[PDB]
Ligand binder design. Structure first.
Ligand SMILES: C[C@H](Cc1ccccc1)[n+]1c/c(=N\C(=O)Nc2cccc(C(F)(F)F)c2)o[nH]1
Length: 167
């Protein structure tokens, strides 16, 4: 039994936390949800995801294509990609926004057993083997993966877990 419970609103918080890990630039209803999996003993958060325009968005490794219970209703997967590590439920992919490249972002981190929180940060670019990946330099536990990363205009520009390749 894999299910979703709501974590909070998707907003750019003006008085958000600011990380010391990076340098500064200059001196059905929508929201974030915890993807859970109940067991014999207790319950355990496997990931995070975004509900937007009647479509639930998360990463493939969280659910692995499993149907999600949502209180009374049930959510079947519509589309996915294993190599990109993405999956949508109830409709096609709707998060069309992207990082501009010259701005700070807010990670709306939704960690396991802990409240949702915005952390402001400048993304770095890391030359990995087989790509220059852009990433937010913030280590959160596994189960936080799928947490949305936001721009100043409120839009989800990426999901936390794996970085983003640049070509
Ligand atoms: C700290 C750790 C570092 C790490 C990175 C990759 C592999 C292994 C380790 N890390 C980063 C992370 N996620 C993102 O940075 N995601 C993201 C997605 C789209 C867009 C943006 C952008 F807006 F910053 F560019 C970021 O998850 N973990």
């Amino acid at each position: 039994d894999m299910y979703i419970e709501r974590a909070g609103d998707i907003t750019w918080e003006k008085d958000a936390e600011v990380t010391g890990n990076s340098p500064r630039l200059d001196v059905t209803t929508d929201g974030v949800y915890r993807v859970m999996t109940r067991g014999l003993l207790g319950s355990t958060q496997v990931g995070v995801g975004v509900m937007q325009e009647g479509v639930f968005h998360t990463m493939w490794h969280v659910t692995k294509g499993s149907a999600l219970r949502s209180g009374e209703g049930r959510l079947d997967p519509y589309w996915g990609d294993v190599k990109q590590d993405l999956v949508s439920y109830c409709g096609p992919w709707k998060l069309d926004a992207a990082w501009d490249g010259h701005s700070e972002v807010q990670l709306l981190a939704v960690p396991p057993g802990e409240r949702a929180r915005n952390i402001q940060t400048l993304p770095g670019i890391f030359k990995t083997k087989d790509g220059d990946i852009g990433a937010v330099a913030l280590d959160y536990p596994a189960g936080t993966s799928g947490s949305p990363i936001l721009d100043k205009c409120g839009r989800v520009i990426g999901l936390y877990g794996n970085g983003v390749v640049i070509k």
